[PDB]
Amino acid sequence: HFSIPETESRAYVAYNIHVNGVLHCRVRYSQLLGLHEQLRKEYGANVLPAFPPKKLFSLTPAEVEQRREQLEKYMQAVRQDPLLGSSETFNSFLRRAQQEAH
Numbered sequence: 001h002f003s004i005p006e007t008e009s010r011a012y013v014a015y016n017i018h019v020n021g022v023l024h025c026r027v028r029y030s031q032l033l034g035l036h037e038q039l040r041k042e043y044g045a046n047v048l049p050a051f052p053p054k055k056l057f058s059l060t061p062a063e064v065e066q067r068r069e070q071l072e073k074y075m076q077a078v079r080q081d082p083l084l085g086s087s088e089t090f091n092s093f094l095r096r097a098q099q100e101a102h
């Protein structure tokens, strides 16, 4: 359902969310972090899946790539959650970001 195949550049890294194998929306780590925090507020740190850590230096390809897997797993985990998957803040976030992909 949710997947993260490719990435991008320029200065920052972006993540191409594919819904059912087609492009869906493009987002950066800070945006997902923002999202995760809107969720932790309102639902509590319990219940929420684990979110990939901040970094203090720019990202090695291996890192970018690893952070890709972990954001991938995270989005799926939230979408699968009865409580989270149907949340307003999650779904509105999806809508806005999709509408954002030019």
Ligand code: NA
Pocket: 012, 013, 028, 029, 030, 031
């Ligand atoms: Na960022």
